Structures are given as C-alpha cells and as structure tokens.
C-alpha cells in the first residue's frame, strides 16, 4: 500500500528508571566519601 | 558449608600450626621484629637493590657504546642466597642478616638464628619471604644480608644493629627457652 522502507529504533526501556537510579547512586557515593573524610580525621 | 580439598588442608595446617607444642629452635621464629623496626630496616635495605636485569643490560651496553669508541668503586648491594649468606656469616663479613619466618621447608633456616648468635652476627628474623623478595628482584629470598655499606648509610646501619639488638635479641632471650604453641 505504497509503503516506504526505513529503519526504526525502538525506545530503549527502563531509561527513566535507570536515569533516576544513577541520579541517586552518584549522590550516595558523594555522601559516603564525605563520611570517610571525617572518620579518617578521628584516627 | 563445603570447602575444597586443598582449602581444608591449609586451614587444617593453620590450626595445626597453633595447637601443637613446638620445639624452641622453631617458634624462635614468629617472635619476630615489630612494625616500626621492620619499616626502618627496609628504609635502609631499599637503598641497596641489586641492579635489576634490565638496568644491568642497559648500563653494560652503555659501557660498550662509549668505551669502544671514545676508575669506578666497587658498588654495594644486599646479599641474598642461603649458600652465600651462611658463607658470609663465618667469614665474618655480615653486619645485619635478615631471616624470613615463613620458609617452605622449615628445616632450611633453623640453624641460622643460633649460628648468627654464635658468630656474633647481629641478626633479625623479619616477617615475610615475599617482603624480603621485593628488595632483591626475586619472588622469594629466605635470607638477605648487608656486608659493606656507603658511609652515608653507615651510622644508620650501626644504629639499626643496636636497635635490633635491643628490640629483638633482648626481648627474645626467653625464646631460646620455652616450647611454643600451648594455646588452649
């Protein structure tokens, strides 16, 4: 029915779920690094 | 839990190392030099790394590339074979003999601390044959000796002798006595 052949990327799933997950993970490792600094000053 | 055969064997050997009563020529090991004195022994011993195979090769090609086209003192290094260390003690050329506590057959190095006490050689049983290995271009060394020295390091070496005499030989005069391993 006069259709044009082309290629299509499907939407990569869990993009928003992992996005928010990495947003949280980055902040968590920052805070853990700060806690390490203080506890090392108690040595 | 279920472990492998060899894992069970080395764990069984570990608990066997503790729970048996042991003869006083062994357990004269493990009564070894403490952290500060060990670090201070190596702060001297690291200044005398035997010239590694690459360094020796490049230098002796430098001798060839220069001397063939267009005086040096004898250099000092640590001395590291058991045949050679027990040669050097009894010469008597050894000022500090370092002995590993962990040796594959224990029977190898059992005479050595007492032969050093006999000859008057100021010895120290240091912890790790790997740790001795590092300062000597080898995986393992069992023994490391320091015969001669540069005069900059001479006073430090003499004090290293006196520190090891006081820290090691005086604290562990009871170690010639007392069968180790009576841990309940």
């Amino acid at each position: 029915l006069n259709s044009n052949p082309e290629i299509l990327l499907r939407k990569r799933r869990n993009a928003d779920r992992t996005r928010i997950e990495r947003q949280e993970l980055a902040k968590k490792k920052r805070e853990e690094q700060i806690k390490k600094k203080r506890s090392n000053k108690n040595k | 839990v279920k472990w492998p055969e060899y894992v069970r064997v080395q764990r069984q050997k570990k608990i066997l190392s503790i729970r048996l009563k042991v003869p006083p020529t062994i357990a004269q090991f493990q009564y070894t030099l403490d952290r500060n004195t060990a670090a201070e022994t190596f702060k001297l011993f690291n200044k005398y790394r035997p010239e590694t195979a690459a360094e020796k090769k490049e230098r002796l090609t430098k001798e060839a590339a220069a001397v063939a086209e267009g005086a040096s003192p004898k250099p000092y290094a640590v001395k590291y074979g058991l045949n050679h260390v027990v040669a050097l003690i009894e010469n008597k050329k050894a000022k500090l003999v370092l002995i590993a506590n962990d040796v594959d057959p224990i029977e190898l190095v059992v005479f050595l601390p007492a032969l050093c006490k006999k000859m008057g050689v100021p010895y120290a049983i240091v912890k790790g044959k790997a740790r001795l290995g590092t300062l000597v271009n080898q995986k393992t060394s069992a023994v490391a000796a320091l015969t001669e020295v540069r005069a900059e390091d001479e006073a430090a070496l003499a004090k290293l002798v006196s520190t090891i005499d006081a820290n090691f030989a005086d604290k562990y005069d009871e170690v010639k006595k007392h069968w180790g391993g009576g841990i309940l």
């Binding site: 259709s3 044009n4 290629i7 299509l8 990327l9 499907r10 939407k11 993009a15 | -």
Partner: protein
C-alpha cells in the same frame, strides 16, 4: 516538567531571546549525546514499512445512498399510550394493525 522523560515530544523548553549575546549555555547537552550513544548500541533496530498514504483510500468504494432510494429518513407516527417499555412489535400481512 510533570511528564516523565523519554516519553516527551521536546527535550527542551522553547525560549525567546532578543539578543544573541543573551543566549544561555544549554546545560542538558551532554545528556543528549550520551542518550543518543546509548540509543545506537542498546536500542533494537527494526526494519519497518511506514504506510505513507491518505486515510481516504481505506473506505471501500461503495455506491452513494442517494442512488439506492427509497429508504426511511425521519419519524412520522409516535405511539404514546404505554406506561411500560415496548419490548416487542408485530405487523399484520395486510398492513394496518400494528400490535405492541
């Protein structure tokens, strides 16, 4: 801003600027190239046929109702007399007596 990301028509707010000097450094630019990079090796590639056609050529070719007369258009006779819903009907074969 309420809609979840990746199910969104524009990755940006359209904005007006009088001067070219007044154009801000677009902050969410690394995010766009990173998401495209992920779209290359993680998003599944499918061969599709896009049906580029008018909607008008989907209705079958059927004769216009005006050339198929007669047929009833509007109501004439409203039968108001019941207190209950007319569930059933029947007509006589002759054509006068309509039963409810």
């Amino acid at each position: 801003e309420n809609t979840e990301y990746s199910e969104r028509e524009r990755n940006f707010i359209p904005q007006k600027y009088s001067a070219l000097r007044k154009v801000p450094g677009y902050g969410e630019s690394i995010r766009e190239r990173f998401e495209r990079s992920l779209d290359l090796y993680l998003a599944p590639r499918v061969r599709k046929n896009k049906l580029n056609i008018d909607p008008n050529s989907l209705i079958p070719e059927l004769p216009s109702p005006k050339d198929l007369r007669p047929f009833p258009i509007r109501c004439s006779t409203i039968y108001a007399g019941h207190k209950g819903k007319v569930r059933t009907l029947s007509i006589d074969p002759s054509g006068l007596w309509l039963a409810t």
